[PDB]
Amino acid sequence: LNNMLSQLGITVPTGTNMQLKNVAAVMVTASYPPFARQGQTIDVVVSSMGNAKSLRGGTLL
Amino acid sequence: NYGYQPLFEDRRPRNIGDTLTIVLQENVSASKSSSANASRDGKTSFGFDTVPRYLQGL
Numbered sequence: 001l002n003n004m005l006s007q008l009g010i011t012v013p014t015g016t017n018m019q020l021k022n023v024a025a026v027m028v029t030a031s032y033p034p035f036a037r038q039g040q041t042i043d044v045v046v047s048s049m050g051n052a053k054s055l056r057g058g059t060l061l
Numbered sequence: 062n063y064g065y066q067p068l069f070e071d072r073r074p075r076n077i078g079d080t081l082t083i084v085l086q087e088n089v090s091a092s093k094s095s096s097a098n099a100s101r102d103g104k105t106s107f108g109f110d111t112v113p114r115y116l117q118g119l
């Protein structure tokens with residue numbers, strides 16, 4: 001999250017609490033189909049990585 | 062710049078112009094020792110100070 005914020009233009013100090021509960025680290029897996037074209041879209045599967053309780057209405061970024 | 066940039070990665074240097082921070086923290090220490098010794102001592106004695114009459118010949 002800090003890396004994303006720094007890339008977007010916000011640099012959080014290294015020593016900070018940063019105790020958030022609305023985000024979850026996830027791994028996304030996809031099946032690259034044969035003859036895949038540049039503009040096409042595919043379905044993905046998102047699975048929690050840490051100790052997140054649920055991903056009910058989350059958004060993958 | 063039109064290049065692609067990841068959001069969640071650790072922003073490692075990737076191209077020629079990228080800059081990186083180096084912490085030297087170098088510490089090397091080597092030691093070597095060797096020794097050798099050799100001592101020999103000998104000391105022999107023999108004396109009568111009184112010789113029997115029958116042994117005076119030798």
Ligand SMILES: CCCCCCCCCCCCCCCC(=O)O[C@H](CCCCCCCCCCC)CC(=O)N[C@H]1[C@@H](OP(=O)(O)O)O[C@H](CO[C@@H]2O[C@H](CO)[C@@H](OP(=O)(O)O)[C@H](OC(=O)C[C@@H](CCCCCCCCCCC)OC(=O)CCCCCCCCCCCCC)[C@H]2NC(=O)C[C@@H](CCCCCCCCCCC)OC(=O)CCCCCCCCCCC)[C@@H](O)[C@@H]1OC(=O)C[C@H](O)CCCCCCCCCCC
Nearest residue numbers: 104105106107108109110111112113114115116117118119
């Ligand atoms: C590994 C084992 C291998 C085996 C080794 C074999 C033995 C290997 C050899 C060991 C013996 C050393 C030889 C020494 C004499 C010698 O040859 O090498 C000399 C140079 C040294 C080289 C040695 C390098 C070895 C290199 C090392 C090698 C080691 C291996 C040249 C020389 O000759 N120098 C010489 C010269 O000097 P000058 O240069 O300046 O001129 O002349 C002056 C003046 O002469 C004297 O004058 C006196 C009067 O004035 C006169 O008395 P008077 O009565 O007349 O008054 C008197 O007569 C007399 O003794 C009168 C009478 C005395 C009788 C009393 C009873 C004693 C019994 C005593 C009994 C002894 C018991 C063992 O005699 C004898 O019967 C002697 C006894 C003979 C025993 C035989 C053994 C039977 C086996 C009995 C076996 C017993 C079984 C249990 C006159 N004496 C002489 O002439 C000299 C000579 C006359 C020879 C004629 C007699 C028949 C010899 C007949 C045959 C002998 C052949 C060997 O006698 C000796 O000692 C000979 C000793 C032999 C012992 C060998 C044992 C073998 C074991 C056998 C083992 C296999 C001397 O002083 C001087 O000699 C001296 O100083 C010597 C000094 O004293 C004594 C010091 C001894 C300390 C131990 C060594 C310590 C040295 C250690 C450091 C290196």
